[PDB]
Amino acid sequence: GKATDRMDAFRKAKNRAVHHLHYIERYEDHTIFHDISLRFKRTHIKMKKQPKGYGLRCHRAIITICRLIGIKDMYAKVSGSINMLS
Amino acid sequence: ETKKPTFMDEEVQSILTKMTGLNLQKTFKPAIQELKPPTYKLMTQAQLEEATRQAVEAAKVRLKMPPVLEERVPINDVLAEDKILEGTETTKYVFTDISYSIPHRERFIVVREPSGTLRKASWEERDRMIQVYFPKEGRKILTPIIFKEENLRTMYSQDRHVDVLNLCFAQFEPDSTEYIKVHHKTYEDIDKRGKYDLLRSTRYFGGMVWYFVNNKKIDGLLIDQIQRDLIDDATNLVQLYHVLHPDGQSAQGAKDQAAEGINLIKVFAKTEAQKGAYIELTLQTYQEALSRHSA
Amino acid sequence: PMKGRFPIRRTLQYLSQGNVVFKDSVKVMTVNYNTHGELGEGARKFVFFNIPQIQYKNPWVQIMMFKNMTPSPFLRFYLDSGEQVLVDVETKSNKEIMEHIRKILGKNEETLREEEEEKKQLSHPANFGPRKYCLRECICEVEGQVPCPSLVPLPKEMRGKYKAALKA
Amino acid sequence: VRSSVHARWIVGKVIGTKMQKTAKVRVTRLVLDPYLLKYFNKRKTYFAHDALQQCTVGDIVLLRALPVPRAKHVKHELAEIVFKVGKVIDPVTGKPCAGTTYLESPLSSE
RNA sequence: ACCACGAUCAAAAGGGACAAGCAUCAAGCACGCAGCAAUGCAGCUCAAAACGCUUAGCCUAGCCACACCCCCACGGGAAACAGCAGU
Ligand code: FES
Ligand SMILES: [K+]
Ligand SMILES: [Mg+2]
Ligand SMILES: [Mg+2]
Numbered sequence: 001g002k003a004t005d006r007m008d009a010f011r012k013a014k015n016r017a018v019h020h021l022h023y024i025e026r027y028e029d030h031t032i033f034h035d036i037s038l039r040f041k042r043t044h045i046k047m048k049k050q051p052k053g054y055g056l057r058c059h060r061a062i063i064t065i066c067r068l069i070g071i072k073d074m075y076a077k078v079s080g081s082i083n084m085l086s
Numbered sequence: 087e088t089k090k091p092t093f094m095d096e097e098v099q100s101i102l103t104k105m106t107g108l109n110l111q112k113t114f115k116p117a118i119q120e121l122k123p124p125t126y127k128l129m130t131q132a133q134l135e136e137a138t139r140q141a142v143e144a145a146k147v148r149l150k151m152p153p154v155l156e157e158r159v160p161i162n163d164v165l166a167e168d169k170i171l172e173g174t175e176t177t178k179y180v181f182t183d184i185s186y187s188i189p190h191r192e193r194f195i196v197v198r199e200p201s202g203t204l205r206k207a208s209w210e211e212r213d214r215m216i217q218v219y220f221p222k223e224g225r226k227i228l229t230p231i232i233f234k235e236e237n238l239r240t241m242y243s244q245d246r247h248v249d250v251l252n253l254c255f256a257q258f259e260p261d262s263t264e265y266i267k268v269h270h271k272t273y274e275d276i277d278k279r280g281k282y283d284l285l286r287s288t289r290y291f292g293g294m295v296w297y298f299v300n301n302k303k304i305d306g307l308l309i310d311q312i313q314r315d316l317i318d319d320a321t322n323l324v325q326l327y328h329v330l331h332p333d334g335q336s337a338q339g340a341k342d343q344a345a346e347g348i349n350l351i352k353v354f355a356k357t358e359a360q361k362g363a364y365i366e367l368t369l370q371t372y373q374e375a376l377s378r379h380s381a
Numbered sequence: 382p383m384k385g386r387f388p389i390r391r392t393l394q395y396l397s398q399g400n401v402v403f404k405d406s407v408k409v410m411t412v413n414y415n416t417h418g419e420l421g422e423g424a425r426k427f428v429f430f431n432i433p434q435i436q437y438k439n440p441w442v443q444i445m446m447f448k449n450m451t452p453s454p455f456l457r458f459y460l461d462s463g464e465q466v467l468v469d470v471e472t473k474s475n476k477e478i479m480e481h482i483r484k485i486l487g488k489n490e491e492t493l494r495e496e497e498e499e500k501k502q503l504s505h506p507a508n509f510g511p512r513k514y515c516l517r518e519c520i521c522e523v524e525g526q527v528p529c530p531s532l533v534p535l536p537k538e539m540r541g542k543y544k545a546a547l548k549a
Numbered sequence: 550v551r552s553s554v555h556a557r558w559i560v561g562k563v564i565g566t567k568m569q570k571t572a573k574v575r576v577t578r579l580v581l582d583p584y585l586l587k588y589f590n591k592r593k594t595y596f597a598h599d600a601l602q603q604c605t606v607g608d609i610v611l612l613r614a615l616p617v618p619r620a621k622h623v624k625h626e627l628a629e630i631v632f633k634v635g636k637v638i639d640p641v642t643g644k645p646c647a648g649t650t651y652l653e654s655p656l657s658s659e
Numbered sequence: 660a661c662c663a664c665g666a667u668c669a670a671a672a673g674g675g676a677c678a679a680g681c682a683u684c685a686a687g688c689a690c691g692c693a694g695c696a697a698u699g700c701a702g703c704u705c706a707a708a709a710c711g712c713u714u715a716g717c718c719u720a721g722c723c724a725c726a727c728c729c730c731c732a733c734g735g736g737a738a739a740c741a742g743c744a745g746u
């Protein structure tokens with residue numbers, strides 16, 4: 001969201017995000033189905049499937065997003081550029 | 087001449103193994119412990135049936151019945167009475183031979199008393215010294231308080247009888263007085279409340295059956311098997327009863343009448359069974375439901 | 382990622398999966414193989430996959446390779462007695478080669494089990510000492526025995542500070 | 550059979566024949582790189598007693614340890630020439646070869 | 660106890676293995692071999708790091724080294740707590 005005022009940017013961002021929704025598959029509704037290792041531009045993300053009770057041991061931004069998706073147990077490591085948007 | 091079978095006889099072990107049953111879901115129940123991420127395999131229908139076959143073999147090893155031993159006789163043997171040492175010490179010494187390659191039941195463990203006597207250690211002193219120098223995982227030098235009567239009733243109220251038997255097996259020796267006392271109190275609580283299903287598919291079911299048959303109290307377990315459509319087990323239970331009590335009213339009635347199958351349960355229900363009336367009724371209800379399915 | 386093809390070979394787990402533990406007589410193992418030819422394919426995979434596992438389990442056996450010296454691949458073992466064992470490996474796969482040398486010059490599962498047991502006798506459970514060598518450092522760790530004064534102060538009667546005070 | 554020499558049997562490549570009755574042999578062993586967990590060749594020189602001066606630079610020889618060293622650096626003796634340089638005999642067939650090609654076909658003597 | 664043709668323990672001697680940094684330390688300079696000897700041959704080590712400089716007790720159930728200095732200790736300088744307490 002972009003605007004001169006911060007509250008206007010907040011409005012634009014959250015109202016627009018609800019029209020660009022993904023659906024994320026979850027194994028047993030608590031973790032991912034398999035280890036995920038990818039690169040987006042210069043940002044590397046490595047995610048590991050974990051058992052119940054492991055918790056979210058990830059970059060704080062990944063923790064925030066995982067709570068919104070519904071993932072409870074996962075390990076993630078971010079390498080390279082730590083660009084938030086990437 | 088004619089010896090009565092023992093618990094470890096091939097004929098008895100085969101009967102008790104079938105009566106126990108094998109439920110992979112219960113035998114391999116998920117344990118609450120530190121977890122690791124699971125692994126995955128792609129299998130055909132044949133590979134899956136083979137993997138399930140190996141699981142049944144691993145379960146039959148986990149269901150291996152512990153041997154039922156008689157209570158050990160107390161140890162009271164003096165090696166020497168050195169009276170010249172009388173009154174020279176106030177505390178007794180316990181000497182333990184810790185030579186590595188020796189069976190624990192062959193290790194010499196002696197005690198020098200303040201009176202000068204050199205005697206062999208008692209069974210309780212032995213098992214305590216063996217745990218001090220050869221610590222076994224799950225065993226404690228001091229007897230846990232869970233085995234007190236007040237705390238065992240709490241475990242029975244929660245239907246944790248198998249946990250009591252797992253705790254007892256890890257703490258006491260099979261021929262120990264504490265081991266036999268706890269097992270009998272657990273069997274008696276199962277018989278009083280009809281909780282025989284708690285021990286099915288476990289290595290403790292055979293020991294429980296062996297206890298009921300020797301003490302002539304199979305009426306409860308027999309009723310439980312008929313109510314669950316386990317007549318193949320209920321018939322083997324009556325046969326095992328006749329084998330261990332050949333000169334009995336029921337055993338003779340089966341010979342005179344040449345009873346077989348369900349007929350054995352009827353002969354037993356009339357002669358030696360204490361709850362004979364409740365067995366005939368429970369057995370009658372079974373034959374009805376079996377006729378409805380036939381018709 | 383780890384460099385090279387089949388990086389699994391450069392892991393301790395893979396190297397310990399070798400089942401060939403030569404008898405004490407084996408001193409040298411030469412490998413003659415050809416870089417090209419369909420009939421020497423199993424010998425090339427043997428050099429590529431298994432030689433590291435053999436060397437890992439037999440660190441004191443000399444292993445030397447030779448390329449394209451003869452028309453066909455073969456292994457040759459030199460024993461301490463002076464005997465030489467020739468093994469023709471042309472047409473065989475690398476798995477069949479490992480199973481062959483294991484049968485003629487490898488220690489059986491019985492001989493290896495015994496050796497592992499004789500090692501367990503070196504760490505007696507009843508001995509007290511540093512954690513590197515013993516399970517427990519002091520008898521005070523055994524329940525029922527007098528605990529360490531650093532955790533449970535001893536009664537004044539069992540302390541020399543007050544034994545000498547009363548006596549003096 | 551006992552001997553005070555450490556390396557009892559070793560195979561190596563002759564790299565020098567300038568000493569009288571002595572062949573300089575290069576012996577290579579596989580040594581594990583602890584960090585990379587990859588095996589690399591580690592070479593060492595051995596002087597071997599060659600009474601008949603039959604060693605040629607480049608041939609593969611088998612060395613046997615002497616009971617006691619005969620000189621400061623001579624602890625082994627030539628036990629056998631495994632691969633004579635440029636005159637290899639295929640051990641599998643017993644025929645002479647030149648690289649990966651036979652000089653005499655194995656079918657000659659059936 | 661004494662002999663133990665032995666066991667245990669463990670020197671000297673022989674073989675092998677064994678720290679870090681610097682290659683702007685790149686060559687070392689006799690460092691080899693044969694022969695019973697006389698003597699003969701000219702070899703030996705080294706970029707897979709010789710030779711050299713600098714730093715450091717170590718791989719800790721403990722081990723190594725040192726014991727005022729001259730690596731050593733006949734001798735010399737000289738008159739000794741790096742045993743405990745203490746200055
Ligand atoms: S460590 Fe055992 S008495 Fe202190
Ligand atoms: K000194
Ligand atoms: Mg020495
Ligand atoms: Mg350079």
Ligand SMILES: [Mg+2]
Binds near residue numbers: 683
């Ligand atoms: Mg400079």
Ligand SMILES: [Mg+2]
């Ligand atoms: Mg150097």
Ligand SMILES: [Mg+2]
């Ligand atoms: Mg220093």
Ligand SMILES: [Mg+2]
């Ligand atoms: Mg001083």
Ligand SMILES: [Mg+2]
């Ligand atoms: Mg000195």
Ligand SMILES: [Mg+2]
Binds near residue numbers: 740
């Ligand atoms: Mg001082």
